[PDB]
From Swiss-Prot, chain A:
Entry remark concerning the domains of this protein: The N-terminus adopts a forkhead-associated (FHA) like fold. BRCT domain is characteristic of proteins involved in DNA damage signaling. It is required for localization to chromatin which flanks sites of DNA damage marked by phosphorylation of hta1 and hta2.
UniProt-annotated location(s): Nucleus; Chromosome; Cytoplasm, Cytoskeleton, Spindle
General function of this protein: Involved in DNA damage response (DDR) mediated through its interaction with phosphorylated H2A proteins hta1 and hta2 which mark the discrete foci of DNA damage.
Annotated protein name in UniProt: DNA damage response protein Mdb1
Assembly notes: Homodimer. Interacts (via BRCT domain) with hta1 peptide containing the S/T-Q motif in vitro; this interaction requires phosphorylation of the hta1 peptide at the S/T-Q motif.
Consequence of gene loss (knockout): Strongly resistant to the microtubule depolymerizing drug thiabendazole (TBZ). No effect on DNA damage sensitivity in response to ionizing radiation (IR), ultraviolet (UV), hydroxyurea (HU) or camptothecin (CPT) compared to wild-type.
Length: 88, 89
């Protein structure tokens, strides 16, 4: 599927990756968020941003103890107050 | 704030559901079924060793270094090992 984050069109083709500001495989210190796609389920880990799924704020987490949140509302994900659209 | 799992009732921060389903343990032993978490007044479930459903969505199990946290978006349809879980005040 494709991730639209304001400006950005990004594709996600194999269970996920890291969202840079302007999908990367490695977690650099300039990536905002981590995506996982498995068995038709979408998960987001917050690294360095303000992240919302509907009314839920996604707590940031470190790479050795990741907190990956099931995206229970694929239509209300926000990152840094910018809407994210997923489309297959 | 109180969880009943089949016949057993327990109180809960958060914690780990024992195999029994009697109480919520503080540390993750290797016989506990699931983790309940309370984060900013919202209930989340991490599956460890059980078959867990929230409504029609399968709750995938996850290891502690990569937790998959499911917001309990339907409190009336939580099932663990095909056993209904009721949440009460």
């Amino acid at each position: 599927m494709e991730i639209q984050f304001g400006n950005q069109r990004c594709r996600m083709v194999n269970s996920g990756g890291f969202l840079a500001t302007d999908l990367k495989e490695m977690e650099t210190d300039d990536v905002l968020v981590e995506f996982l796609n498995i068995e038709h389920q979408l998960f987001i880990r917050n690294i360095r941003a303000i992240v919302k799924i509907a009314d839920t704020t996604v707590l940031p987490s470190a790479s050795d103890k990741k907190l990956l949140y099931y995206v229970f509302d694929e239509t209300r994900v926000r990152i840094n107050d910018t809407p994210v659209i997923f489309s297959k």
